[PDB]
Write a protein that binds this DNA or RNA. Structure first.
Ligand SMILES: [Mg+2]
Ligand SMILES: [Zn+2]
Lengths: 90, 166, 126, 261, 53, 53, 50, 319, 293, 35
RNA sequence: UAUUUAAUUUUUAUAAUUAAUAAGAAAGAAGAAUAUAAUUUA
RNA sequence: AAAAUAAAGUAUGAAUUAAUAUCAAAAUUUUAAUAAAAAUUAAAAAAUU
């Protein structure tokens, strides 16, 4: 029983509860008949130059749950023949 | 089924709304700690505890009744006066009582949530004040009385219903 | 020698030196129920205070609570609190058993099961 | 110290010391322009940053951001104050071109909408100006400098009269690069707030704003800066401009220090 | 750079030498002839309480 | 002897905190007006007779 | 190369001073006239409180 | 070796990450805000008199400003800029009721014209007022009075001509004419061709639509009403040296610096020999950064008359 | 070296952007900071910019120079055209491995005379048994792969129950793979062996001869996709019959495993063509092999 | 480490693949290319 | 022998939201023992 | 370091040792000489080898 694992002992269930309180938003944005995944804006400034003058890049990856729900639900199409019949060059 | 891929089904028929709510109160989903407790003198924390070296990864926090209960609260969460809740003007009075006792029975406290309780009770009195003028029976008193018993149980006593019965 | 673990009184707002002047007490209590405590002067040199009773003060509290909750409605905590004010005004006795006990024993009213084993207000020989 | 899902990107977490182990904050420690400084005012970051674009603070920095929901790619901005169908003139700016020519400082794409026909201008004007301190008047693109003072107006102590005539004193003094035959002084009869008028090779005449409490070098530098603006302006007409004997911005120079022993 | 004992022991040796502030620590920098650089000796730019008094 | 009078002081002080003052003034002006209520008694009044306190 | 859009001369084929004040166009920022509107500065280009 | 706490990086590598100019986890508590308000010599005024609006700016109320005028008309310190500032303060009142507020503008006008023979400021100001009051022929009349008087109509005067020509509901080519005449005159210096730049001006004025209109900056009426700015350490600059709220005996000193002649440094020029270097200056905390802003006597109102209508609420004074 | 370049958050602002900096007004993106509609909240010494000829001309030049020279600027197209979801994002995609068995040991030669000691692994039945996303938190998703079909009476009575609930045939063994949302495959998917390309490097987790071990670099040698073997050039310290958990080694020192030069994986799962039937197909013609090391 | 994935072993099922057949098959492929 | 470390408490379907640098019915042999989960076997 | 021998075992059953409270884990300074003595912060479960 140090400081920190007692801290998380108490607070991680509270973080879970708090994000549950975050999930109910979508829920009354469901119940009233709206169906929308709340969108995340695309950020055009991901390319930058720092003080030592070199190229720095930021990676933003956006997960689409309507794609995921389709991804798990049905098979992918047949693997193209360029893939397995030719090896991966080392 | 009832939340993600078929959101309309609970709103359409209150019957299974109450049935699901009561089953969900019967197993106690909001105190999983007593799923693992063999002696009530020593309450077991199996559900609420995790350590980083891996104890209780399998018995860890299972969101179980989370989505359901939050959803079927938010079906009753229409506080907007623009449109009244669509199921509550669909329910039988006895049904209103039984789903109030549903909400009152699910929570670990044994007390209903304020918005829900207010909503249902205020929806009930506006039916009682209507139906007492029309065709009425002694059984329809049973509905009212075991409404007031729940109303006392959750600790907001109704002065109006009590002064109706007395 | 050990570190002192006795309880410490909270700091209190510093005086502006106005208090130093006589006829100005350095206790400042001007509060909601203040005007109701009426001071009378006894022949002894002692004083005589007239105050509203216990249940009157708590009834005032109840009125203020209801009057703040008329707008947004009454939340569960408000419900429980109003219940307890309402009980302690009418008390006439002392309460020694947990408030939840009655609810725990009466839970069968709330959650009804199938009708085979369903429990009623009379049970035996039926 | 990585556990759980690790992304194929080569080093994202390496700067916070190789781990993913907190990540649930929306709030970090911040210098100016860092995240939670959205809501505070600053000169630089009011015009240099969008206040949706503030990421997390110091060494925990976003190299990799994974969020869920739909993407909004909002369309790029369309450029103001030009009609469609308009055919601009195109320029080639290069590092090959040194900074000594005005061909570095102007619009790269050049429309006919942005070309003033007020002045004779074939190509539009520049957007960026060079900055130095002009210690002296040197004849740049000017052909005449007229200084008109009415002596009737009289004052004791420091006054604008003193400033303008100090402008003159500096113009005609021994160390002034300005050729001293083209500085003209006029005594006027009726009560003139002394003005300085410089006429260029365009026939255009500029009068600097002699302000209350003006001094000698203010007018000098005003004249010189406006002289640059006018060199460019005349350059817009198609005049062929001779190179300046003295360079006020030292482009071709380095700061040189004297020796040791 | 050489660390002077206090601010009084700090002089400007050349024509181009300047007084500058290194985070509340007064110092002298010459853009030419860097051997003229002088620091006032004082606390580190980053110090905690237990770590530095 | 010290622990317990510390407890008593704490209770009377918090009971004064509910009224927007504290032990620090209350002691002085129970001294000034010559009331002579021992702090133990002030605790008894704070807990069993809030109106009198 | 390593150069940013700002400070880049053309797309055709710093630590010592972190903050800037934004530049108005060259012919605009040489003498920049007052125009009273109701206690604001209005130009063809910029606004201000003054 | 937790690496969330004690990472594998040397202190030499890591000491760049120590914030010395720290922004968000702020060092100024709330209790100080009022204190640091008092030491700067600022005074809390009632809502009628003025207030610190949404940008924490102290704006002086109209009908408050006019009373300040009517007390200070003949005062020695009252300069000709104070008059035009007063008139500028009266403009929303000018629009929302032109009948009873143009009389005020004319009072200031006549009084100004007899305290000083004539001024450029005053004519700009009142033709702006007449522009907002939508009396256009008044604008031409006034301009003719300028030219007849020997006054050279200013660039601003032409912008006022354009404004009056616009919001009086009169067509383009009556504004266009003002712009072209103004640019022939050598008042407006426009770098672009006439058409596009007139487009620019009109596009600025359409953003600036009036106090009575449905779309415009001036048409926005909401005002954060505060007696005190809710951040006292607020910044117009970069550094803490450049803070927005400075002491009054400082704001005397900078005004003294402004209205005294330019012998050391450049006025009007874009060079500015002394370059802004906030990062170069002292970075460190003073004892008032710890113990709080120094205590000064709270600014008090002696012998104020009793508050009649204390129950009544002040209406937002935009009228 | 083993650190990337350090860029602070303060340092990303209009003057540091590689491409033109864009401000977001929320219905529209512009290059001018949003001018607040309430004019009285304008701060002093602030220029509200409605137009700038300096920053708009560079944008003007940039855009045109893009459409006018599309062949030079194709990398610039990354700015305006982000990859949509799925579609095998090189940096964002993590797929699952499968559960093998250490079958036997063998020896091969490459093109030159070189003795290799191969270890041959067997992939008896690999099916996606379970999906677990933990409370919907991002980057938390697992796919559970089972192997080695096993009679009804084998497992303890609580294991069989699990398999009955899933619907998947009863397996000897299950292992979880953390993966990204795009890499999902439906429950009960038969996994083939050529899910693993013969050129790649594989992460291997197995039991030592007696704790768990992880080998993070090991290249694939050869694949029998008839008998569902896979060959590897290593001698493991492991009992024959040990269940071995496979994964793709997702980065080798700054280099991604999958890239245009090196190659591309069959992404969520491999699927066989409809026209092939392995019951007609011999062992030798069923062979796949690496390029020479 | 005592978990189920690690402790359980597949020995008993090894008749499901012909080990001896594949070794000889790659012997054939050894003499076909001539190692 | 006390502390201290290291291992174990005898298959955990599964592992890591944090600390520091993880656990389902039971004991003979874990083998019916000569490495096949029966080499046909009276 | 391979080979031979010996350690869970049923039965018998000693000896050194013993001021102790269910114990005394980690760090810091102090105190008349290690200081398992103080104080403070802290973070030592059970059994077996
Ligand atoms: Mg005693
Ligand atoms: Zn030097």
């Amino acid at each position: 029983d140090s400081f920190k694992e007692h801290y998380h002992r108490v607070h991680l269930p509270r973080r879970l509860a708090l994000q549950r309180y975050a999930r109910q938003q979508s829920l009354r944005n469901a119940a009233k008949g709206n169906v929308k995944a709340e969108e995340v804006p695309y950020k055009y400034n991901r390319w930058w130059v720092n003080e030592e003058h070199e190229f720095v890049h930021q990676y933003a990856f956006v997960e689409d749950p309507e794609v995921t729900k389709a991804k798990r639900e049905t098979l992918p199409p047949v693997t193209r023949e360029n893939i397995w019949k030719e090896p991966q060059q080392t | 089924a009832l939340v993600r891929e078929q959101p309309w089904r609970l709103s359409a028929s209150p019957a299974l709304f109450i049935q699901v709510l009561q089953f969900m109160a019967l197993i106690k989903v909001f105190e999983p700690n007593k799923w693992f407790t063999f002696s009530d003198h020593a309450p077991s924390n199996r559900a609420d505890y995790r350590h980083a070296i891996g104890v209780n990864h399998s018995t860890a926090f299972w969101g179980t009744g989370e989505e359901l209960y939050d959803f079927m609260v938010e079906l009753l969460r229409v506080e907007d006066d623009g449109r009244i809740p669509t199921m509550l003007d669909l329910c039988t009075r006895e049904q209103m009582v039984d789903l109030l006792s549903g909400f009152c029975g699910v929570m670990p406290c044994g007390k209903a949530v304020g918005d829900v309780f207010k909503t249902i009770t205020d929806a009930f009195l506006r039916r009682v004040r209507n139906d007492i003028s029309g065709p009425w029976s002694a059984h329809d008193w049973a509905i009212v009385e075991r409404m007031y018993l729940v109303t006392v149980l959750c600790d907001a006593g109704n002065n109006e219903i009590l002064q109706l019965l007395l | 020698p050990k570190k002192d673990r006795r309880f410490r009184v909270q700091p209190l707002p510093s005086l502006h030196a106005n208090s130093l002047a006589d006829d100005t007490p350095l206790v400042t209590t001007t509060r909601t129920l203040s005007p109701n405590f009426r001071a009378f002067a006894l022949q002894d040199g002692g004083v005589f205070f007239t105050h509203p009773s216990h249940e009157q003060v708590m009834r005032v509290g109840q009125n203020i609570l209801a009057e703040e909750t008329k707008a947004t409605g009454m939340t569960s905590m408000d419900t429980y609190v109003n219940s307890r004010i309402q009980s302690i005004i009418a008390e006439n006795t002392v309460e020694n058993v947990a408030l939840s006990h009655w609810r725990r024993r009466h839970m069968w009213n709330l959650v009804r099961t199938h009708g085979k084993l369903q429990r009623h207000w009379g049970v035996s020989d039926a | 110290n990585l556990k759980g899902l690790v992304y194929p990107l080569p080093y994202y977490a390496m700067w916070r010391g190789n781990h993913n182990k907190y990540t649930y904050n929306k709030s970090t420690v911040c210098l100016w322009g860092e995240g939670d400084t959205r809501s505070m005012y600053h000169q630089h970051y009011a015009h240099a940053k969008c206040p949706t674009d503030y990421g997390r603070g110091g060494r925990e920095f976003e190299y990799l951001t994974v969020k869920r929901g739909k993407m909004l790619q909002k369309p790029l901005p369309r450029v103001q104050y030009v009609a469609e169908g308009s055919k601009p003139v195109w320029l080639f700016k290069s590092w090959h071109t040194p900074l000594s020519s005005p061909s570095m400082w102007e619009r790269e794409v050049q429309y006919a909408e942005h070309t003033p026909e007020h002045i004779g201008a074939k190509r539009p004007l520049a957007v960026v100006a060079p900055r130095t301190m002009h210690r002296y008047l040197f004849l740049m693109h000017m052909e005449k400098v007229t200084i008109t003072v009415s002596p009737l107006l009289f004052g004791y102590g420091h006054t604008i009269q003193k400033a303008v005539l100090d402008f003159y004193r500096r113009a005609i003094s021994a160390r002034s690069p300005f050729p001293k035959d083209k500085v003209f002084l006029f005594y006027a009869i009726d009560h003139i707030t002394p003005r300085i008028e410089v006429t260029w090779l365009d026939g255009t005449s500029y009068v600097p704003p002699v302000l209350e409490g003006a001094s000698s070098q203010d007018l000098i530098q005003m004249v010189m800066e406006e002289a640059w603006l006018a060199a460019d302006r005349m350059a817009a007409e198609g005049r062929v401009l001779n190179p300046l004997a003295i360079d006020d911005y030292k482009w071709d120079q380095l700061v040189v220090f004297k020796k040791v022993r | 750079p050489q660390m002077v004992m206090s601010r009084d022991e700090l002089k400007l040796r050349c024509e181009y030498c300047r007084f500058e502030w290194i985070h509340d620590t007064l110092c002298v920098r010459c853009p030419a002839q860097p051997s003229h650089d002088q620091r006032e000796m004082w606390l580190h730019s980053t110090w905690m309480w237990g770590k530095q008094q | 002897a010290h622990w317990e009078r510390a407890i008593v002081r704490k209770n009377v002080d918090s009971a004064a905190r509910e009224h927007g003052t504290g032990w620090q003034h209350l002691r002085n002006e129970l001294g000034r007006q010559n009331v002579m209520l021992l702090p133990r008694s002030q605790q008894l009044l704070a807990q069993y007779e809030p109106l009198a306190f | 190369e390593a150069i940013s859009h700002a400070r880049r001369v053309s797309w055709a084929p710093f630590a010592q001073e972190p903050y800037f004040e934004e530049e108005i166009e060259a012919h605009r920022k040489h003498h920049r006239p007052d125009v009273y509107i109701y206690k604001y500065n209005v130009s063809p280009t910029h606004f201000s409180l003054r | 070796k937790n690496l969330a706490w004690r990472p594998k990086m040397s202190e030499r590598t890591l000491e760049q990450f120590v914030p010395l100019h720290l922004a968000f986890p702020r060092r100024h508590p709330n209790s100080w805000q009022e204190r640091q308000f008092h030491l700067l010599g600022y005074v809390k005024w009632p809502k009628e008199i003025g207030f610190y609006n949404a940008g924490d700016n102290f704006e002086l109320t109209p009908q408050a400003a006019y009373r300040i005028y009517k007390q200070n008309c003949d005062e020695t310190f009252w300069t000709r800029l104070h008059n035009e500032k007063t008139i500028i303060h009266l403009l929303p009142l000018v629009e929302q009721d032109p009948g009873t507020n143009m009389v005020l503008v004319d009072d200031i006008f006549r009084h100004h014209l007899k305290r000083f023979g004539a001024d450029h400021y005053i004519y700009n100001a009142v033709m702006q007022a007449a522009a907002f009051a939508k009396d256009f022929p008044r604008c031409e009349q006034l301009l003719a009075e300028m030219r007849g008087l020997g006054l050279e109509p200013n660039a601003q005067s032409y912008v006022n001509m354009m404004l009056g020509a616009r919001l009086t509901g009169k067509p383009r080519d009556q504004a266009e004419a003002f712009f072209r005449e103004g640019i022939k005159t050598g008042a407006i210096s426009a770098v672009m061709r006439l058409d596009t730049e007139f487009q620019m001006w009109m596009n600025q004025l359409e953003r600036l639509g009036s106090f009575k209109a449905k779309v415009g900056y001036l048409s926005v009426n909401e005002e954060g009403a505060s007696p005190m700015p809710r951040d006292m350490w607020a910044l117009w600059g970069w550094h803490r040296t450049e803070a927005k709220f400075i002491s009054r005996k400082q704001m005397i000193s900078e005004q003294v610096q402004n209205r005294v002649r330019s012998g050391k440094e450049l006025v009007g020029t874009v060079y500015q020999k002394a370059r802004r270097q906030p990062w170069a200056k002292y970075n460190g905390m003073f004892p008032y950064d710890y113990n709080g802003p120094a205590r000064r006597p709270a600014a008090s109102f002696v012998d104020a008359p009793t508050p009649t209508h204390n129950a009544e609420v002040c209406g937002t004074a935009y009228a | 070296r083993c650190y990337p370049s350090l860029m602070r958050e303060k340092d990303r602002d209009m003057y540091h952007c590689y491409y033109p900096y864009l401000f977001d007004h929320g219905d529209k993106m512009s290059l001018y900071p949003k001018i607040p509609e309430n004019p009285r909240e304008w701060q002093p010494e602030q220029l509200q910019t409605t137009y700038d000829a300096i920053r708009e001309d560079k944008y003007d030049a940039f855009i045109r120079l893009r459409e006018k020279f599309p062949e030079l600027y194709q990398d610039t197209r990354a700015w305006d055209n982000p990859p949509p979801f799925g579609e095998f994002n090189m940096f964002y995609s993590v797929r699952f491995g499968m559960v093998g068995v250490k079958a036997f040991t063998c020896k091969d030669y490459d093109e030159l005379g070189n003795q290799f000691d191969c270890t041959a692994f067997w992939f008896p039945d690999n099916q996606v048994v379970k999906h677990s996303t933990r409370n919907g938190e991002v980057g938390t998703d697992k796919v559970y792969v089972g192997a080695m079909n096993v009679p009804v009476e084998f497992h303890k009575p609580h294991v069989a129950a699990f398999y009955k609930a899933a619907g998947v045939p009863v397996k000897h063994v299950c292992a979880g793979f953390p993966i990204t949302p795009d890499a999902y495959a439906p429950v009960g998917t038969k996994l083939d062996v050529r899910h693993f390309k013969p050129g790649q490097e594989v992460t291997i987790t197995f039991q030592n001869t007696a704790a768990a071990e992880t080998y993070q670099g090991v290249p694939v040698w050869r694949i029998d996709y008839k008998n569902s073997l896979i060959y590897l050039p290593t001698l493991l310290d492991a009992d024959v019959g040990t269940y071995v958990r496979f994964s793709d080694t997702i980065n080798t020192k700054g280099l991604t495993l999958w890239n245009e030069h090196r190659g591309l994986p069959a992404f969520p799962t491999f699927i066989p063509p409809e026209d092939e039937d392995l019951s007609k197909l011999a062992t030798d013609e069923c062979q796949l092999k690496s390029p020479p090391l | 480490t005592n978990r189920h994935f690690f402790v359980a072993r597949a020995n008993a099922f090894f008749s499901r693949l012909p080990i001896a057949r594949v070794q000889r098959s790659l012997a054939m492929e050894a003499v076909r290319e001539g190692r």
